[PDB]
Amino acid sequence: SGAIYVGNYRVVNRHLATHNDWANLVWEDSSRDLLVSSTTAQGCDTIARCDCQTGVYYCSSRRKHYPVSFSKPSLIFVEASEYYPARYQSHLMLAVGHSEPGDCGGILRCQHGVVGIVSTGGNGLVGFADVRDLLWLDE
Numbered sequence: 001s002g003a004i005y006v007g008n009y010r011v012v013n014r015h016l017a018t019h020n021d022w023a024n025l026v027w028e029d030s031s032r033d034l035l036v037s038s039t040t041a042q043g044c045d046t047i048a049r050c051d052c053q054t055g056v057y058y059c060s061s062r063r064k065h066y067p068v069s070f071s072k073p074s075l076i077f078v079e080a081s082e083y084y085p086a087r088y089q090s091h092l093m094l095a096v097g098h099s100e101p102g103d104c105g106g107i108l109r110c111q112h113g114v115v116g117i118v119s120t121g122g123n124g125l126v127g128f129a130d131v132r133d134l135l136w137l138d139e
């Protein structure tokens with residue numbers, strides 16, 4: 001679990017969004033596994049606006065932060081699950097690293113701020129849904 005709180009927005013994995021998230025829906029995209037809902041309180045997370053390919057992510061399954069090199073945002077095949085059929089998930093960045101179902105929502109960060117959140121994993125890999133292109137999160 002986990003979310004990004006920036007301004008009057010809450011960014012979560014679309015497959016883990018709550019009834020409240022859907023009742024205050026701003027934008028959602030199944031192909032990116034992202035959902036953004038509105039909030040009453042102000043969020044103090046900074047979003048990175050960069051092309052860094054190195055950062056640090058939080059891994060709940062180990063209660064530890066790990067440094068990773070990650071690929072640029074791209075279309076990657078993701079196996080079928082109870083949330084989606086087999087499909088290509090866009091804006092996804094992969095790294096070699098530990099991840100388990102439960103780690104979704106963990107923040108990936110570089111020196112510029114928040115890069116994305118854990119969205120896929122397994123096989124000694126971890127996939128992050130990128131949020132750096134969502135410029136409206138800041139205005």
Ligand SMILES: NC(=O)[C@H]1CCCN(C(=O)C(c2ccccc2)c2ccccc2)C1
Pocket residue numbers: 015033078081083084089099100101102103104118119120121122
């Ligand atoms: N974006 C999606 O479509 C995800 C929806 C939830 C499922 N999913 C995973 O990748 C998930 C997983 C769960 C059960 C078997 C295999 C994989 C996982 C595993 C390790 C770390 C994070 C998540 C795909």
Ligand SMILES: [Zn+2]
Pocket residue numbers: 048049050051052110111112113
């Ligand atoms: Zn950066």
